[PDB]
Amino acid sequence: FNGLTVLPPLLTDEMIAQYTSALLAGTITSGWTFGAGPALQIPFPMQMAYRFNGIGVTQNVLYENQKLIANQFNSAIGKIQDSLFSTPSALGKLQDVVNHNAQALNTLVKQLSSKFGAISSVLNDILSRLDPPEAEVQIDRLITGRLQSLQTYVTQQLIRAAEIRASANLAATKMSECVLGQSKRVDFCGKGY
Amino acid sequence: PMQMAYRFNGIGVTQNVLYENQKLIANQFNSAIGKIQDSLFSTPSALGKLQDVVNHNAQALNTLVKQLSSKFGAISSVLNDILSRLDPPEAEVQIDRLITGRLQSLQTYVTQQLIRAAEIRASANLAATKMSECVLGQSKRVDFCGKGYHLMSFPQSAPHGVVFLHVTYVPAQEKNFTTAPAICHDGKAHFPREGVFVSNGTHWFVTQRNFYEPQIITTDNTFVSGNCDVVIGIVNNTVYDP
Amino acid sequence: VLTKSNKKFLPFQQFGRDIVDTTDAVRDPQTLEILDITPCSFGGVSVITPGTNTSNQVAVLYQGVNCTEVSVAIHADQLTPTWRVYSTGSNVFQTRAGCLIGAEYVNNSYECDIPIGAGVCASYQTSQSIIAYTMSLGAENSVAYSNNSIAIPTNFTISVTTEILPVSMTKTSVDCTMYICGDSTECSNLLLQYGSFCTQLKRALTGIAVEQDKNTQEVFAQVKQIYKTPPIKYFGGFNFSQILPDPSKPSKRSPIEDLLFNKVT
Amino acid sequence: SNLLLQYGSFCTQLKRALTGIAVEQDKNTQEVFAQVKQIYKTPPIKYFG
Ligand SMILES: *[C@@H]1O[C@H](CO)[C@@H](O[C@@H]2O[C@H](CO)[C@@H](O[C@@H]3O[C@H](CO)[C@@H](O)[C@H](O)[C@@H]3O)[C@H](O)[C@H]2NC(C)=O)[C@H](O)[C@H]1NC(C)=O
Ligand SMILES: *[C@@H]1O[C@H](CO)[C@@H](O[C@@H]2O[C@H](CO)[C@@H](O)[C@H](O)[C@H]2NC(C)=O)[C@H](O)[C@H]1NC(C)=O
Ligand SMILES: *[C@@H]1O[C@H](CO)[C@@H](O[C@@H]2O[C@H](CO)[C@@H](O)[C@H](O)[C@H]2NC(C)=O)[C@H](O)[C@H]1NC(C)=O
Ligand SMILES: *[C@@H]1O[C@H](CO)[C@@H](O)[C@H](O)[C@H]1NC(C)=O
Ligand SMILES: *[C@@H]1O[C@H](CO)[C@@H](O)[C@H](O)[C@H]1NC(C)=O
Ligand SMILES: *[C@@H]1O[C@H](CO)[C@@H](O)[C@H](O)[C@H]1NC(C)=O
Known part of the structure; x- marks a missing residue:
């Protein structure tokens, strides 16, 4: 805390949870029809039959194998929790962002204690030790050093915000095509049909 | 009209609808295109992302030319006075200071321009993809060429950018029905070929999935697969044979 | 402390x-x-206004401070905006973003107008003044799911939407000699000792310049040949006159194109 | 601060760039998550097949 402030997000975590719940409810109760107009209700097995038609498999495969498919789906969801919890280095990409931000802030707050070719990193010591003539030179040196530090920080932040924007655009496209509908693109919404 | 019949067939709706509602569809399209002009004209902050580019470039140039008046901890901000006021050594010192400051200004400007150029290059590639997929063809990607099912897209030029008019299809006036995955007639299950089974309370019909059009169930609309003991929600009606 | x-x-x-x-x-x-x-304690003193054309009342948001402290320091004199405080009373609200003075917290909820922070937005409503509230995410619509209930549309609507995208930016070029050492023969000799910064600045600017033309060529020149519409006749009933060229005015554009060209400056 | 005043308008651009990033973040979140018009509620959580 030396002039650096962190601002809160506009959308709180509960609101994002409520969007996620709304999207899930629309998917499970209406199908793919709530992203392209008013939502229309449809039973879940019929929706899954429509999706099998979409991947090129007839309807008979689903209705004559309903229990087996339901069991496989339930087992997969069950194993997802264990797979995520067992591996510690699973959510590494998100941790990289916070770690890089912390490193940048810490480097910035550390560079206040570098003499930068001056007598001392404490300005009060500089002022109450010598005359205004040399004080001008020392203060100018410190000002140039800290201005360069700030410029570096801001440029790095912009470069990283560019990448985060690209990832956000990709996530939006995935939400619009993978969640609000069915994708024929290969290796986009998973490894498989 | 044949082109739009093909467009309709590409979103799941048969060709009967367009040829039987051509006048209504043409009127709807004309009214929408009419409203577009008023919607663009009335709202001032519509072409905003296009204005931001011009404003940012102007601000960059203005700050660059404003920092030329900065003194950067020198005697003054003009070379003529610094030259014609003092000795060559201190002149060298002051000129070195000013040169360093102005090099820093140029470096900042060029880096900012590179970053903004990268962003605009990404936007331009996106625009090219939209032109190739929504104007030269029909896109099945959801919410890529407009909200709703896609029919057409038209381009328009604009200062430093493009404006796409997306023409899309939105269903309306829904109605409730009772469904059933299959129907058993003579001990064997029948499944639909392209539609869903509905019933208004008394009789059963087979219909499409995006526009109500009931049809009687016949052997040329349904296909048979297996007996009737394995499916869950199977009703028992008749499948006529023409 | x-x-x-x-x-x-x-x-x-x-x-x-x-x-x-x-x-x-x-x-x-x-x-x-x-x-x-x-x-x-220190932070920002951000300002919320509905518009000078509409009113003159304002609200002030202090970021990341306990309303208590502000008030304490409002009493006596410890703050440094020096505004004599924008009007106190039953108008000091404490939100997760900070301390808000000039608006009253209602229990209602509608679409956000001016974001403030956390769930807290502000607007100007009815006498009429600035109010602050918790954002509403939209209405609640429970779909009637059932084991044997389906919904089928009976009508359609043809809609036209607009999307806007930047394609290019202005091409600029800068000369070191005129910028740094303006019309001085005694400054140029002292710039040759700083190396070859100028050549790489010029290279970067030229690269941006050529990329600007590559962008336009890639976006627009996707047709090998130029096609012309026939003597405009019955397209089945579809009008199209608002997007096609109008051969009755210079620059041969179209009415929507003219409106676009007459609103961006 | 008096000496810093002579260095020009570095500060206004630094602040503008930081605020640009700040608003961009909220825009990104809104684009990713606020894709639905109305909030949909699940029924009494029941047999989904
Ligand atoms: C859609 O189909 C499901 C079939 O699974 C229906 O749910 C079932 O409804 C019956 C009652 O109608 C439930 O039976 C009750 O079970 C409890 C068990 O403790 C028992 O104490 C009661 O006396 C009664 O037998 C049954 O459990 C329930 N099954 C599930 C998994 O929900 C559902 O009602 C149908 N929905 C519609 C549209 O009616
Ligand atoms: C469900 O739709 C069918 C459409 O065929 C209706 O059947 C006809 O309804 C009219 C009503 O005036 C009768 O005059 C016809 O004789 C009926 N024909 C058949 C096929 O029986 C049926 O009445 C509708 N039922 C409900 C509950 O709406
Ligand atoms: C296409 O739509 C435009 C917009 O309404 C029509 O233009 C108007 O047409 C009437 C009748 O000719 C003229 O009196 C108006 O002055 C026109 N307004 C404009 C915008 O110039 C146009 O006629 C329609 N095209 C067809 C073939 O009906
Ligand atoms: C149809 O279903 C009823 C009730 O399950 C059953 O009694 C009957 O034998 C079935 N067969 C047909 C096609 O009538
Ligand atoms: C602010 O001060 C009050 C006074 O006790 C305290 O209750 C509260 O927890 C503090 N924090 C905030 C910001 O509400
Ligand atoms: C469909 O909508 C149009 C326009 O609202 C209306 O004129 C027409 O009568 C409607 N048709 C039906 C079947 O309701």
């Missing part, structure tokens, strides 16, 4: 330091008591 602490120093230590450099703690040389040093 020097508050009481509970750190257990060792008998030979004087100060204390945090993970970076800062003097978090200190020990008084006389009474030999640990004292925690916490920095003075």
